[PDB]
Amino acid sequence: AGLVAWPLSARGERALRGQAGRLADWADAGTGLSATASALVHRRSALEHRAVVTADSLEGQLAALRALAAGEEAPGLRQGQLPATQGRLAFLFSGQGAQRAGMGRELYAAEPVFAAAFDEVCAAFGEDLRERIFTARQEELDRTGTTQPALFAIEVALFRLVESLGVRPDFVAGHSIGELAAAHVAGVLSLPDACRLVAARGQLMEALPEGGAMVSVRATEDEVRAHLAEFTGRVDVAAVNGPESVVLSGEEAAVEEIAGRLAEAGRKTRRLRVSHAFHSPLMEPMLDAFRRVAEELTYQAPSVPVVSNLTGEQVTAFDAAYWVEHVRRAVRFADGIGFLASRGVTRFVELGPDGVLTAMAQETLTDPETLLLPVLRKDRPEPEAFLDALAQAWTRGVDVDWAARYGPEQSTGVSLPTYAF
Amino acid sequence: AGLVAWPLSARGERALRGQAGRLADWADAGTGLSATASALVHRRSALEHRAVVTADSLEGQLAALRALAAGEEAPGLRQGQLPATQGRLAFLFSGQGAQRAGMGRELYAAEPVFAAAFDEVCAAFGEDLRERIFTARQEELDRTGTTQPALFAIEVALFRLVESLGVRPDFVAGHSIGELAAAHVAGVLSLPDACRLVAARGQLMEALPEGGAMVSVRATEDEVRAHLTGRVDVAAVNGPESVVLSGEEAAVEEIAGRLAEAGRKTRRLRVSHAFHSPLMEPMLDAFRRVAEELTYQAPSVPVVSNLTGEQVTAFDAAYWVEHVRRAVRFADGIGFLASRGVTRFVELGPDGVLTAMAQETLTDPETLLLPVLRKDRPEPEAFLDALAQAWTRGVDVDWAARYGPEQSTGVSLPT
Numbered sequence: 001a002g003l004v005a006w007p008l009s010a011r012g013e014r015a016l017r018g019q020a021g022r023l024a025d026w027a028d029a030g031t032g033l034s035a036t037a038s039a040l041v042h043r044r045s046a047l048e049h050r051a052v053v054t055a056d057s058l059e060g061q062l063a064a065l066r067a068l069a070a071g072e073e074a075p076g077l078r079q080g081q082l083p084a085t086q087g088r089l090a091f092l093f094s095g096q097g098a099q100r101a102g103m104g105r106e107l108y109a110a111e112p113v114f115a116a117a118f119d120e121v122c123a124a125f126g127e128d129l130r131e132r133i134f135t136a137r138q139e140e141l142d143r144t145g146t147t148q149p150a151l152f153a154i155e156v157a158l159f160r161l162v163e164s165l166g167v168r169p170d171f172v173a174g175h176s177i178g179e180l181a182a183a184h185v186a187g188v189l190s191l192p193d194a195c196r197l198v199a200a201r202g203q204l205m206e207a208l209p210e211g212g213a214m215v216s217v218r219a220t221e222d223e224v225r226a227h228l229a230e231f232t233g234r235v236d237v238a239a240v241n242g243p244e245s246v247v248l249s250g251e252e253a254a255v256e257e258i259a260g261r262l263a264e265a266g267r268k269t270r271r272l273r274v275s276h277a278f279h280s281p282l283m284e285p286m287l288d289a290f291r292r293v294a295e296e297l298t299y300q301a302p303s304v305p306v307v308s309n310l311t312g313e314q315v316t317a318f319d320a321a322y323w324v325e326h327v328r329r330a331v332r333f334a335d336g337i338g339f340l341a342s343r344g345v346t347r348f349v350e351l352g353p354d355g356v357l358t359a360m361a362q363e364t365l366t367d368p369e370t371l372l373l374p375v376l377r378k379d380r381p382e383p384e385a386f387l388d389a390l391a392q393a394w395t396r397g398v399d400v401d402w403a404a405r406y407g408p409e410q411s412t413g414v415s416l417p418t419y420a421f
Numbered sequence: 422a423g424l425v426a427w428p429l430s431a432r433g434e435r436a437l438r439g440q441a442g443r444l445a446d447w448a449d450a451g452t453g454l455s456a457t458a459s460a461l462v463h464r465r466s467a468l469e470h471r472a473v474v475t476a477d478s479l480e481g482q483l484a485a486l487r488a489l490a491a492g493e494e495a496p497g498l499r500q501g502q503l504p505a506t507q508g509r510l511a512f513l514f515s516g517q518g519a520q521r522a523g524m525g526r527e528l529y530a531a532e533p534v535f536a537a538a539f540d541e542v543c544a545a546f547g548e549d550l551r552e553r554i555f556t557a558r559q560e561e562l563d564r565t566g567t568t569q570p571a572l573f574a575i576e577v578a579l580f581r582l583v584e585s586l587g588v589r590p591d592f593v594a595g596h597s598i599g600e601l602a603a604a605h606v607a608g609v610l611s612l613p614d615a616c617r618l619v620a621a622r623g624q625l626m627e628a629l630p631e632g633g634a635m636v637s638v639r640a641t642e643d644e645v646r647a648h649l650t651g652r653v654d655v656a657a658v659n660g661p662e663s664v665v666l667s668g669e670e671a672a673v674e675e676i677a678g679r680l681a682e683a684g685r686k687t688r689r690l691r692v693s694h695a696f697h698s699p700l701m702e703p704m705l706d707a708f709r710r711v712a713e714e715l716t717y718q719a720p721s722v723p724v725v726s727n728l729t730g731e732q733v734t735a736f737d738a739a740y741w742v743e744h745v746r747r748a749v750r751f752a753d754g755i756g757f758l759a760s761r762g763v764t765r766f767v768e769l770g771p772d773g774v775l776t777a778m779a780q781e782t783l784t785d786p787e788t789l790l791l792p793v794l795r796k797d798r799p800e801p802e803a804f805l806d807a808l809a810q811a812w813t814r815g816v817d818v819d820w821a822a823r824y825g826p827e828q829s830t831g832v833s834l835p836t
Contacts, residue, residue: 042829
């Protein structure tokens with residue numbers, strides 16, 4: 001005869017004891033043992049309501065608290081409610097075009113874990129990278145030999161920051177350069193190997209010549225691929241970011257011609273502001289030197305599952321060959337998202353300078369229940385944006401280890417009324 | 422101007438809103454922003470009381486509940502209270518010692534995650550190990566060529582089971598062979614590399630000749646190294662008081678009588694060979710040969726070393742060879758774990774012998790030391806009771822992974 005456990009919890013002992021008495025009274029006439037076990041665990045999660053009030057003064061905290069009491073909305077108040085069943089959590093690492101001049105500088109000054117990991121990553125690269133990223137003009141930042149190290153540095157620093165706050169992903173994924181960050185952070189590459197890989201990836205493409213274009217098209221992959229027959233080796237699909245969101249890449253003239261035919265057929269196209277035709281045949285000339293670098297490195301099994309841009313499903317095996325193809329072939333981002341939802345991921349946290357990947361993922365997900373969060377936003381200062389993303393996440397059930405930010409030593413002496421609960 | 426967040430939680434919206442209004446009333450007269458953030462985190466945690474009633478019938482469940490209601494104790498009832506600061510959690514993996522014939526079989530039949538991982542590990546050794554371990558007589562078990570793969574298989578299976586229920590360690594540690602299971606599980610070895618290493622470790626030392634003894638002693642490490650040539654060594658430093666010597670039978674007997682003459686207790690161990698002694702030296706060259714063929718990764722989770730009694734981040738063939746030869750500094754490792762804020766120690770093994778050893782080092786009531794399996798109890802009951810007790814003291818168990826949501830549909834709990 002199988003034993004069944006009924007787990008009860010309450011605030012204070014008398015309430016625990018009362019709950020037990022009532023549960024027994026209710027159960028006296030009969031219930032399923034294991035049915036009642038489930039009910040006890042899922043009722044408890046679904047009942048929990050949460051809020052966070054955030055301000056830089058007591059006056060501000062008080063106002064947001066009063067608003068919550070009265071059932072009002074307010075700036076600095078986030079609130080929500082856990083689901084019965086808690087879903088899995090993925091980090092999404094940003095790609096090209098995300099970078100903005102001065103990114104990271106506010107967070108650096110305010111968040112010592114982020115600062116320390118950022119310094120460490122930049123030191124690994126050498127070349128006075130941290131200052132260049134903080135100091136550099138936009139044009140300098142958008143040089144892809146600088147861009148890819150910078151994005152990698154920021155994204156890995158952000159990962160350590162959120163990891164220090166106890167937020168642990170069940171999956172990681174990235175877009176283009178973002179994948180290299182996700183790999184490093186899942187333990188596939190040592191930092192020195194990772195920097196060597198990223199440094200060469202950027203530097204080798206920056207040397208490629210001009211005349212490449214990229215155009216985003218609002219159509220299906222099949223619709224776009226129809227047009228590529230007559231333009232092999234000149235144009236390719238660079239990305240499939242959504243069910244109707246695909247990016248064409250290659251020699252300018254060819255790309256223009258294809259784009260124009262798709263626009264004649266009623267489909268909207270948008271030329272991207274980029275230096276090179278990424279993920280296209282125009283990348284071919286650097287690939288031999290890139291393999292040479294990647295072949296010198298050591299590749300481990302990932303500690304956390306990594307979603308592949310190549311396949312749109314899980315990678316288990318990383319090698320020099322993978323990273324070379326990665327550079328060349330289409331980024332199957334939308335398939336990646338679909339894969340993550342299939343594995344029960346309902347929380348998506350974007351690590352990177354903005355919310356670009358979050359909006360792309362929404363093209364696939366489209367559900368109010370699921371949560372997609374950028375950790376930084378162009379709209380607000382970085383410290384504020386980060387702290388609000390933590391608040392919002394926690395409010396919807398993401399485990400955040402607030403104690404790591406607000407240590408027990410600071411509470412010593414505070415007498416918080418018990419009925420404060 | 423730094424932003425500060427105050428996180429509030431409650432049961433239902435009405436209560437959350439009421440708690441907010443009372444917190445503001447309290448705070449109006451002044452209070453440190455970040456101080457109040459900490460207090461909110463920690464005091465909320467400190468308050469939570471938990472219990473678990475476990476039985477195989479309704480009658481049992483009801484009685485245990487009525488006992489809880491009245492404040493009494495009862496079979497099937499566990500109960501406790503979270504601490505303010507949730508301490509860190511370590512897994513302790515058992516060394517050869519209390520392996521028992523038929524170990525794992527009950528758990529195999531009742532827990533599919535444990536079954537699948539056990540099958541997988543045994544298949545990786547091959548050679549009908551899975552049939553061997555359940556089937557085997559105690560003496561068969563005791564042959565280290567058998568013992569070490571078996572223990573490794575059981576301990577890795579238990580880890581996957583505990584992991585499937587959401588219990589995740591911040592550190593792992595092992596005694597002797599236990600360290601190999603801990604290393605594999607922290608991702609240092611592939612499974613095929615791991616079984617190859619443990620298969621060889623066991624077989625090579627089974628083939629060593631008779632004539633080795635081990636004795637455990639009730640006295641400090643310093644006191645024992647005094648009464649030490651190259652015939653006998655320290656095999657382990659389990660507790661501040663307790664240590665183990667190992668080596669040539671005659672020499673060991675000699676050092677033992679001599680410490681017994683000084684009024685301190687000694688205990689002859691029932692072992693096949695003199696582990697972690699000079700008597701291991703003849704296998705070490707062949708063992709290095711096997712180890713040097715393998716690939717060693719950086720650990721995903723911090724691993725505590727038997728060699729040093731602190732963390733290791735570097736594993737190679739050389740490490741494992743020295744590991745075999747030199748003393749197991751278990752007590753130091755336990756001390757190291759406490760130093761890092763570990764307050765929850767769960768032993769993954771056939772029996773809870775390790776928990777007792779650790780207990781030597783740690784005497785606080787607040788610290789929790791739990792074996793997951795118990796001799797004298799059915800394994801499924803033992804495993805369930807360890808879960809219940811752990812959760813009750815704040816270890817985060819994912820109960821939903823055992824009792825899924827689909828079974829709750831239709832049940833209306835009392836409000």
